[PDB]
Amino acid sequence: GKIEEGKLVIWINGDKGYNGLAEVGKKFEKDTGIKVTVEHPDKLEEKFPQVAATGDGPDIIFWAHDRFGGYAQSGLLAEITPDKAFQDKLYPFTWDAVRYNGKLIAYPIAVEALSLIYNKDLLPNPPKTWEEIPALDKELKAKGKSALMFNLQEPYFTWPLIAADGGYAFKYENGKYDIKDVGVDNAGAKAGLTFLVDLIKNKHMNADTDYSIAEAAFNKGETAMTINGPWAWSNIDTSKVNYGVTVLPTFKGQPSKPFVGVLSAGINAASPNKELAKEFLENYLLTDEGLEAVNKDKPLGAVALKSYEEELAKDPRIAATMENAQKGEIMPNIPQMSAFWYAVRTAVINAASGRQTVDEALKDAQTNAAAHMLESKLIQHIATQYLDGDHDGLNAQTPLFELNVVDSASIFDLVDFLRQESHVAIGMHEIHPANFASVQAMVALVQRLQAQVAA
Ligand SMILES: [Mg+2]
């Protein structure tokens, strides 16, 4: 073919144990005569869809799973065929991260989620419930310290509590995420966010705490607890703090539901070496000995293979990661998560600051996400159609007129696209510069129009 037959080329990020992975590849070659080449290009996750579309690229790509949904929609990933006996060797939830339109499109490798991190000297037995945290803060305040500090600026960090009693990102049903069903506007998300705001109002936490401030406070022994992932363990100053890592607290007797990222291995749809790639991944890498080779080069954290997870879980920090991940929410593998992230970032910051109420903030978030999705659709349309498909500094606020895109005939083509994608009638009296000066204004017009008729 155009990818070389009888050879395996693998792409993995340079912050992974690629040298340990290469050791697995050497033993594959010893047994089969097939050479394995491990490469770690910069920006490999952007290069892959470019070169795969032309029939090129690696036979196997390693990356976080949430990117593989777009690769699959472009038809770049082969459908993988592990029998049920093999699937049984990995924790069942990991296979839900690697499915697209009913099909398995990758092998789970390692699993990552937030955990509760705590100062053992200040707090030898950390709390099991969010509810008992205000009582713990008051005791520690008497000795000039606080119970808990974590990054309240980024919704990825506050979602575990918001989703605990019923939040979700996108509804998952019949194998597919429904981008019209964002799970922010319900009683469970409101309950979680409400408990978070009341922590702020009762001064147990401060709304401006971000990543760095929380990390510094924990290293100084000023706060007994924080919330962070495995990437942060090496920055904990163990010359000052003896720390442990544990299951997140419950809310209303429900586990916190942190988002779960799954490092996954996909097979290039243009590779003629699909069967060799399956053999390598199933019978060489996804084994106690294969994962150990990678782990010894650079730790994998918690792994999807049950047997080796049991071994690594002798490290209680790793056991905690997997327990939190089993209770968490798999990150949806669709490009519309960018709308979710934007919409929920806004709502949590506003609820925390007193700007909106928990109720108004969460109801607003569904509308904001749809708005963001439409903007994205428009930006891509305008780029693909008038700019060769590349967004060279194209924003929702970019001035369409000065770009020389809103031509004298091209405007009505844009109106039509707007009519199709939003199912509203757009009269001639709405076709004026303040409505079409930017993508944001076009979306705002569409949003305003929908209400006028639906009332
Ligand atoms: Mg078998």
From Swiss-Prot:
Please list the GO biological process terms of this entry: carbohydrate transport; cell chemotaxis; detection of maltose stimulus; DNA damage response; maltodextrin transmembrane transport; maltose transport
Q: What induces it?
A: Induced by maltose and the transcriptional regulator MalT. Permanently repressed by cold shock in a PNPase-dependent fashion.
Q: Where does the record place it?
A: Periplasm
Q: Name the UniProt key words of this record, in alphabetical order.
A: Periplasm, Signal, Sugar transport, Transport
Per the UniProt record, one Pfam family is: SBP_bac_1
The Gene Ontology CC terms held by the record are: ATP-binding cassette (ABC) transporter complex; ATP-binding cassette (ABC) transporter complex, substrate-binding subunit-containing; maltose transport complex; membrane; outer membrane-bounded periplasmic space; periplasmic space
* A GO term for molecular function: maltose binding
Q: Which family does it belong to?
A: Belongs to the bacterial solute-binding protein 1 family.
Stated role: Part of the ABC transporter complex MalEFGK involved in maltose/maltodextrin import. Binds maltose and higher maltodextrins such as maltotriose.
Oligomer status and interactors? The complex is composed of two ATP-binding proteins (MalK), two transmembrane proteins (MalG and MalF) and a solute-binding protein (MalE).
In Swiss-Prot or TrEMBL terms, this protein is called Maltose/maltodextrin-binding periplasmic protein
**Which species?**
Escherichia coli (strain K12)
Lineage, top ranks: Bacteria, Pseudomonadati, Pseudomonadota, Gammaproteobacteria, Enterobacterales
